[PDB]
Structures are given as C-alpha cells and as structure tokens.
C-alpha cells in the first residue's frame, strides 16, 4: 500500500518505494530545482488488530541547485483502505548559532493521500 | 565530523557514517523501551553548511523492528551538529506507534536528546 | 469573537470568556464528572494585516470526581472568517518517575469550531 | 513546593503562586518593559510514589509596552527533593496569515531551578 505517489494538501508530491527489509527511499517534489532526496524506515510486519503501520522519513533541503541548510523529519502512520492515508507529525530544524538555537525547530502536521 | 560513535544522556549508542552525498547510515542501540540489540538507521544531513558558525542540520529514522523483536513504532530525530571543543548533536524527536483510529490521538510521544562522543 | 462555545473533531466541548486584558477563562468537557477548569491568555491587540490571534490555554485533569495526574496545554491561533476557527497544537504531560520521564509527553493537534 | 521564584539557563525569571484550587498565577521576566502575566494549572493532589506533579502555563507576549503577537505554553512536571526542578516542553505560536500557517509554531524545551 505504501509504494507509489502521495500528495499533500499544500501541493507537495512524494514518490516512495517500500523495500522488503523496511527501507523507504524516494524523492520529494513541489521541476528539478524543487526535487529532493528522501530516505526512511517502516514496520515491515505490522499488527493485525486493525492498527496502522508505523513509519518515518527525512529530507535535507539541499540539492544540486540550492541549499536551505535545514532538514525535515516526518513521523506517522499509514492507514490503508479506500481512503488510504499517511498521517504525520513533523519537525523542521534549521542550522543556527548557539545564540539562536532556541528558535531552531518548527513543528506541524501533514496528511497525505493517493489522490 | 558526524562520522563516529555517539552516546546519549541515557547510554544509548548511535554508530553512524556520513556519506559524501548527504547520506546518513548506521546502527542504533537503545537503553530504554521495547528494545534489544541494534536497529538499522537511515537519514540525511547538510553536506555544505553555512560558514558563519551555524550548526549542521540533520535527521534520521529508526523503525523498532529487528530479528529479535518488533514494537510496531518508529522514531525520528531532527536536530543539528555543532563542532568544537565539545562536539555534540542536539535533537528533538517524535515517536509514533501503530494504533486503531479511536486511539490515534495518543499515538505520538515528543522529547529531546543530546549526543556526545564521550560516554556518560 | 473568541468568547463562546467551541467544539473539536472528537466531540469535546469548551466554553470560554475572553477578557479585556488578555485573560482566558472557562471549562472543558467531553455529565458534570467530565467537566474541568481551563485558564489561559490571548493577544488582546492583534495585527490588522490579516494575521490570526495568538493564544494558549491549560487544563489539569483533576476535578472533584477524577484525577489523571496529568495536564494538557494548547497553543494556537484564532482566525475570523466564513467559519471562525481555532487551530491548535497540544502537549499532554503525565506525572512519571524520573526513569520514565522520556515517555511522559504526548503531542497532537486539534481544530475547534462554533458548529 | 511550586510557589516561589524559578530560573532557567538563559536569564529568564518567573515568580509563581500555586493556589489550593490548582491555580497557577504570576509574572514572567524575560525591566518592567520585559514583564508579562502568566496563568496555568497544576495537579493539586499528586501521587506520593515518587512521581512528579503535572502542570502547565501560558504567557501571551503583550504588556503595556510591547506586543510580539504570539503566545507560549509550557507543559511539564515539578520534581521535589534537594535538587528541585521543573522540566518542560514548550510551544510558541505567532499570529500569521493563512498562507504562512505552516510556519507558525516553534517547539523547544526548558529546565527551571530554584537557584
């Protein structure tokens, strides 16, 4: 259910492959200058009680064309069915001086669908 | 650099290699939770940081499944590496477990971890 | 506009009053047994550029009938519009021993409406 | 144990009174130009088994002198003993337009002591 293309409400698109040994690999896009590498892990043997599938991934916003000196991690779960969804919470950290560290990390949430 | 052996305040061990391409790969060995032995990790970092004395942004994930156990959960650390006399990595983390829908409101824990190359 | 009766996605109900110099007061519910006191603050003089109104509140989960030994804080903003709404992120801390402190705090998000 | 003056490691002070009813009230000193009102709640009947006492508070960053159009909430626990402390996680939310609501909320942590 996870392998494929997922869309968020803000435009963003991501293409993942879920490997047989819990690897997640792919790209995150919004054109070439907006494409970034992703890598992650997921539970390759979830429960059967109807629970969701735990997963996580990271993006560092540096590519061949620009560098924001920042990285985002998403933590969440995959819910299959007709309205398959991935529900997440995320953290985005910027590199800062020690003086500015207190304001280095944003938090939020995202929901991704297959359509 | 980031490449090396790291320890957190709880005696957890993080062995990591930083690739020239911004890739992070390694093994995590925990001190707390449903955990035994090493788990695989993967992440990304900024391979061309600011020169201004800023930190190096980075992040990684562990899914808590190995050949010994499975806790149906994953943790993501997001933070920065600061070099210097005392090198450390400062992170915030999120831990999400699989849950039914009725219980998803309590599926995520939040916390912070500090890693150093010296074991406490 | 902030004064009134609000509802979240899960069926919970919160009645508040916004005071003249930024005080928030009221009760949260989900039967008297499930009724709890809330207190907080808001920006009593927001910007005029279209920005929302920042606020926060706290509830400790103890009343005359029940005590979970825990507390939640909500941090967010009020937005006036077609549907006035308050979007929040929240933190819930449980009293734990020091060995269990690493797992004492949950994070989530909630959206309230007058409907 | 909670009533009193508390310090963090970045030059911030707060003075709090803990009421019999579970009320927290006081002032947060980030010069009167820098003093802001605080309000919160705490568990007025904790466990005696070594657990900390759950609590939370809010400061909206407006006083009679300045206004940052934002609010911080602290969620954590009080731990007594010779080295008493209050361990917290916080969220700071700023007023933003809808277009910038993804970047409205910062997350962090802080530890307060009696000295």
Measure the CA–CA gap between C14 and C25, rounded to whole angstroms: 10
- Closest by CA to A57, choosing from B74, B61, B96, is B61
Per-residue DSSP letters for B18-86?
E-TTSEEEEEEE-SSSS--SEEEEEEEE-SS--SSS--EEEEEEEEEE-SS-EEEEEEEEEEEEE-SSS
Q: What is the DSSP string of C50-105?
A: S--EEEEEEEEEE-SS-EEEEEEEEEEEEE-SSS-EEEEEEEEEE---GGGGGG-E
Phi and psi (nearest 5°) for D86?
-120, 115
Smallest CA–CA distance, residue A20 to chain D, in Å, is 34
Contact predicate B43/B26, CB 8 Å: no
Whether D52 and C92 lie within 8 Å, measured CB to CB: no
Question: Of A86, C71, A104, which is closest to residue B92 (Cα–Cα)?
Answer: A104
For the domain made up of C1-115, give the CATH fold.
Lipocalin (2.40.128)
Helix (H) or strand (E) holding B93: strand B88-97
B84 neighbors A44 (Cβ within 8 angstroms) = no
- CA A97 remoteness from chain centre: 26
Of C10, C102, C108, the CB nearest to B111: C102
Are the beta carbons of D88 and D108 closer than 8 angstroms? no
For C13, other C-beta atoms within 10 Å of its C-beta total 15
Q: Domain B1-120: which CATH class? A: mainly beta
Per the structure block, which two tokens stand in for D92? 């700071």
CA-to-CA separations, A56 to A1, A16, B12, B42, B61, in angstroms, rounded: 15, 12, 20, 10, 6
Look at phi and psi of residue A22 and say left if phi exceeds 0, alpha if psi is from -120 to 50, else beta.
Answer: left
Encode burial over A23-46: b for 16+ CB neighbours within 10 A, e otherwise: bbebebeeeeeeebbbbbbbbeeb
The greatest distance separating any two alpha carbons of chain B, rounded to the nearest whole angstrom, comes to 49
Our CA-based measurement puts residue B33 at a distance from the nearest CA of chain C, in whole angstroms, of 9
* Nearest-by-Cβ selection for A93 from B49, B57, B64: B57
Rounded distance, CA B96 to CA B109, Å? 7
Interface check for C103 against chain B (CB to CB < 8 A): the answer is: yes
Q: Is B107 on the interface with D (CB under 8 A)?
A: no
In whole angstroms, what is the distance from residue A54 CA to residue A56 CA? 7
Resolution in A: 1.9
Question: Residue B72: its chain A contacts at CB < 8 A?
Answer: 43, 46-47, 51, 54
Whether chain D has a CB inside 8 Å of the CB on A106: the answer is yes
- Give the residue from C28, C1, C33 showing the smallest Cα distance to C15: C28
Closest Cβ–Cβ partner in D43, D94, D96 for C62: D43
Across the interface, whether the CB atoms of D51 and C22 are under 8 A apart is answered no
Residue D31's contacts (CB-CB under 8 Å, 6 or more residues apart) are: none
Structure tokens at C73: 């804080």
Q: What are phi and psi of A77, to 5 degrees?
A: -145, 145
Helix, strand, coil shares, percent, chain C, to 5: 10, 60, 35
Measured between beta carbons, which residues in chain B are less than 8 angstroms from residue A74?
76
**What distances in angstroms separate CA C108 from CA A11, A37, A71, A87, C102, one per listed residue?**
23, 27, 21, 11, 17
Are A106 and A89 a contacting pair, CB within 8 Å? Answer: no
Contact predicate D39/C41, CB 8 Å: yes
- Is the alpha carbon torsion for B33, B34, B37, B41 positive or negative? negative
Q: Are B87 and B80 in contact (CB under 8 A)?
A: no
B110 touches chain D (CB under 8 A): yes
Choose the closest CB to D108 out of A10, A102, A108.
Answer: A102
Of A58, A98, A31, the closest CA to residue B22 belongs to A58
Show the tokens assigned to C59. 């509830």
Sign of CA dihedral D55, D61, D62, D66: positive
Where are the strands (E) in D1-115, listed by range?
Answer: 4-7, 13-18, 23-29, 35-42, 53-62, 67-79, 85-94, 105-113
CA distance D108 to D115: 22
Residue A82: φ, ψ to 5°: -80, -45
Beta strand pairing call for A4-7 and D67-79: unpaired
Chain centroid offset of residue C51 CA: 20
C-alpha span between B8 and B15 (Å, rounded): 11
Q: D36, D60 in Cβ contact below 8 A?
A: yes
Residue A2 distance to chain D (closest CA, Å): 25
Tell me which method was used to determine the 3D structure.
X-ray
Degrees (nearest 5) of the Cα angle D10, B11, D9?
5
Closest by CA to A111, choosing from C56, B46, C111, is C111
Mutate to test the interface with C, among B105, B112, B113 (most CBs of C within 10 A): B105
Residues 17-36 of D with CB under 8 A from A: none
C-beta of residue B64 within 8 angstroms of C-beta of residue B71: yes
- Name which of C104, A19, A37, A28 is nearest B40 in CA terms: A19
- Give CA–CA dist C5/A109, Å, rounded: 25
Rounded Cα distance, B38 and B15, in Å: 10
The minimum CA-CA distance between C11 and chain D, rounded to whole Å, is: 23
Backbone angles phi, psi at D33, to 5 degrees: -55, -30
């Amino acid at each position: 259910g996870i392998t494929g293309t997922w869309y968020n409400q803000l435009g963003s698109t991501f293409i993942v492959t879920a490997g047989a040994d819990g690897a997640l690999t792919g790209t995150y896009e919004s054109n070439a200058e907006s494409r970034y590498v992703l890598t992650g892990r997921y539970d390759s043997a979830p429960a059967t009680d109807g629970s969701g599938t735990a997963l996580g991934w990271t993006v560092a916003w540096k590519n061949n064309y620009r560098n924001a000196h920042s990285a985002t991690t998403w933590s969440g779960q995959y819910v299959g069915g007709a309205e398959a969804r991935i529900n997440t919470q995320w953290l985005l950290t910027s590199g800062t001086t020690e003086a500015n560290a207190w304001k280095s990390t944003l938090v939020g949430h995202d929901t991704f669908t297959k359509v």
